[PDB]
């Protein structure tokens, strides 16, 4: 298929600079116009810039004109957004897409946002990156006389977003629920639960694996049975 | 710029139903209107372009009409899969401007939550804080209310509540409530109660642990 992969987000102080990239494969990059689109916390989508396949013309949305430069390396199938003079308003998920000219009987219809990538978050703030403390939640002391058992993992007091919570590195994905992160004070908290059957834990081990890239943190927590 | 207006930002309909999402442009946009689908995990795809024209790979179920300033996306037959947020975008003038989205939710049979209550973990306590967690999983409708009660008295401060989005396969919601206190405050009390009130029940759903019969 077509792959658009953006990388480059993370915290930047207001006034800072960050540089995103968007690796494109499965199509001849040199023949496509490339675009950046962004979406904020309120879910509003916003077009930020476009560059012609040749590199020649780059066009900008007024709110980023003069502060963001768009560019491409046709030889490496990668497109860039150098972001300078960031303002907190620039906090958003940034996406990259390619154009597609569709066939109409009497002309071609230009779609700028035909194929989108997954996105990369940039948080613009003075807040220092904080790692998460991870806590295993195991059942209460009254002997489990239930079929299924729910275990949980709390990941508390971190910044910025995102954080990746897996259970047993992928092996448990049925019955997994990871809750959205809510900003409690100046730091986020999220939680996640898994329901495994009583014959599985404590016998076999359950682990929440959590990674917070911005502080380069990965912790693995054996949720161990409750002590009295 | 041209302003796009989507009349509804959330609608819920049953599988099988026909749902029409509407868009309205502040100005005539000459049929140069496109529809996008952003699914619960950020992924976005082109659904329809030049107001009625479907792109390849998209179901026949999606159709789109319009003239002037008024446009519609009709999803003939709601399938499970269609839970997502739909955006119209005009391509008549520069910039492209997007509408605000319509989140679609699937209406389904009522399910009462399975609640679990988790006492603070040993590692937390040695470090200082005490957080007690309450999972209220798999329920429908979304609207639920939780109250924590510590030795009979409801505690309202220091509570963080989060709901998941509608589960793609059984159309259910899950919620997590955490109450945080200091170890000191936490050890000054012996019974912790998570009280859920929801449509499927008359009497509140109650989970408890007494710190000694924990």
């Amino acid at each position: 298929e077509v792959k658009l992969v953006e990388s480059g987000g993370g915290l930047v102080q207001p006034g800072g600079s960050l540089k995103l990239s968007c690796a494109t494969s499965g199509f001849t990059f040199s023949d496509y116009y490339m675009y950046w689109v962004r979406q904020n916390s309120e879910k509003r989508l916003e077009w930020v810039a476009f560059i012609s396949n040749g590199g020649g013309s780059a066009f900008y949305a007024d709110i980023v004109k003069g502060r963001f430069t768009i560019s491409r390396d046709n030889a490496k199938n990668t497109l860039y957004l150098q972001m300078s003079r960031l303002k907190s308003e620039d906090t958003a998920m940034y996406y990259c897409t390619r154009h597609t000219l569709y066939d109409t009987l009497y002309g071609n219809y230009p779609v700028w946002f035909a194929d989108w990538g997954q996105g990369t978050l940039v948080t613009v703030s003075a807040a220092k990156t904080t790692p998460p403390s991870v806590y295993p939640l195991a059942p209460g002391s009254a002997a489990q006389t239930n079929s299924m058992v729910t275990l949980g993992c709390l990941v508390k007091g971190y910044f910025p977003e995102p954080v990746t919570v897996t259970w047993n590195s992928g092996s448990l994905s049925s019955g997994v629920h990871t809750f959205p992160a809510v900003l409690q004070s100046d730091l986020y908290t999220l939680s996640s639960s898994v329901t495994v059957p009583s014959s599985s834990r404590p016998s076999e081990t359950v682990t929440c694996n959590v990674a917070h890239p911005a502080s380069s943190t990965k912790v693995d927590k054996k949720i161990v049975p409750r002590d009295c | 710029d041209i302003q796009m207006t989507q009349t509804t930002s959330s609608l819920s309909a049953s599988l099988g139903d026909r749902v029409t999402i509407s868009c309205r442009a502040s100005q005539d946009i000459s049929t140069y209107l496109n529809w996008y689908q952003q699914k619960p995990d950020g992924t976005v795809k082109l659904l329809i372009f030049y107001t009625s024209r479907l792109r390849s790979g998209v179901p026949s179920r999606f159709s789109g009409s319009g003239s002037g300033t008024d446009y519609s996306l009709t999803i003939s037959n709601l399938e499970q899969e269609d839970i997502a947020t739909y955006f119209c975008q005009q391509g008549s003038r520069i910039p492209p401007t997007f509408g605000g989205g319509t989140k679609l939710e699937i209406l389904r049979a009522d399910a009462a939550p399975t609640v679990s209550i988790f006492p603070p973990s040993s590692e937390q306590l040695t470090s200082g804080g005490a957080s007690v967690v309450c999972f209220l999983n798999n329920f429908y409708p979304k609207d639920i209310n939780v109250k924590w009660k510590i030795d009979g008295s409801e505690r309202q401060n220091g509570v963080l509540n989060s709901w998941t989005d509608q589960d793609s396969k059984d159309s259910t919601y899950s919620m997590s409530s955490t109450l945080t206190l200091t170890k000191d405050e936490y050890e000054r009390h012996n019974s912790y109660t998570c009280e859920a009130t929801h449509k499927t029940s008359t009497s509140p759903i109650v989970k408890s642990f007494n710190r000694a019969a924990c």
Partner: peptide, 11 residues
């Protein structure tokens, strides 16, 4: 050709 702006473009 490769025009990608607003409306119907031919070559």
């Amino acid at each position: 050709x490769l025009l990608v702006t607003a409306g119907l473009v031919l070559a």
